[PDB]
Amino acid sequence: GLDEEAEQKLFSEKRVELLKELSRKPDIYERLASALAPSIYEHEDIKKGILLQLFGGTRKDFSHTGRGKFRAEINILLCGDPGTSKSQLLQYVYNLVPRGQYTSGKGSSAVGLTAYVMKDPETRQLVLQTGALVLSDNGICCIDEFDKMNESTRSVLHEVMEQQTLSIAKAGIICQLNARTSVLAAANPIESQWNPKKTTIENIQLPHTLLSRFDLIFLMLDPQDEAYDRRLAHHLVALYYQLDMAVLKDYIAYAHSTIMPRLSEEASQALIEAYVDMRKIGSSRGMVSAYPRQLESLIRLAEAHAKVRLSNKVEAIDVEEAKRLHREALKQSATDPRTG
């Protein structure tokens, strides 16, 4: 938790040295991605993205710049056919992370997510009760069935995902609650099935205003592949008859405790070129167009990868990995700049 991470004496020197060795290990990224959800079969990219979400970028103090508050959290949207294990991944993250909240489909409401007023039935006094987005203030909110979220409540997510703030101005109480959450959402393509004729956006059916907030979108699509089907069946049957959580937890805690990656000059130039190329690619008709929110997303992902590496300095390796992850997500490589 946040308090345990803040406390100085959370790790012995031996544990610190062991974690630093694990970091100097060259495949620590893939090791941790595989460790996450150990019983989810080869979702390497999705697991890597979720790991980056857990690690999170750097907290930045832009108060002196009069710019506002920058969201260091990473948001992920798993757009996939029902039965693609997106709900399983959502539940795994929900049960794994402290300060985790879970909502699904039409079971939520704008007031119930933001806040409301009730009558505390022990003091007989009217008090204010938070919602899921506030209870997950410094953690994660998992929104399953993210498409059955009638806009009345989906509108609330704009403020949360943009400025980490929830400005409530009701009859009696005016305030702005901190909602510095990370959103992991699950969406089903229209008709509950991905038409292999409509483009990515036409299938997702989410407004660009919202989709540009998610700094990672994974298309859980099913390739009709013999090897994949056979190995998946083997794994699923193996579950029917038969890294450590400790090291993973300690690694994440140490990373949050004393890792604050900072952009280097080379990484800055790489990010500039990455954003220009990404915008050029996304200019296509039906693809997910890239706005400067995507440069922000690339910075976030690069910082998260640097934190995973414990570098403390964001590097061209990290920015390139952010490029690769954001590109493999949405299947940009596998989609032509005209059709899906």
Added chain:
DNA sequence: AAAAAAAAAAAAAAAAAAAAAAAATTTTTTTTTTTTTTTTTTTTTTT
């Protein structure tokens, strides 16, 4: 047929009109009984 807007309802919170509940010893009077005094009646003593 699906999404958004409108409204319609349900339930909960709040503020008066009427009804219902709570809180409450002390002073003065009179009656009885008992005693004291007056006069009449009766008794006793002296011539």
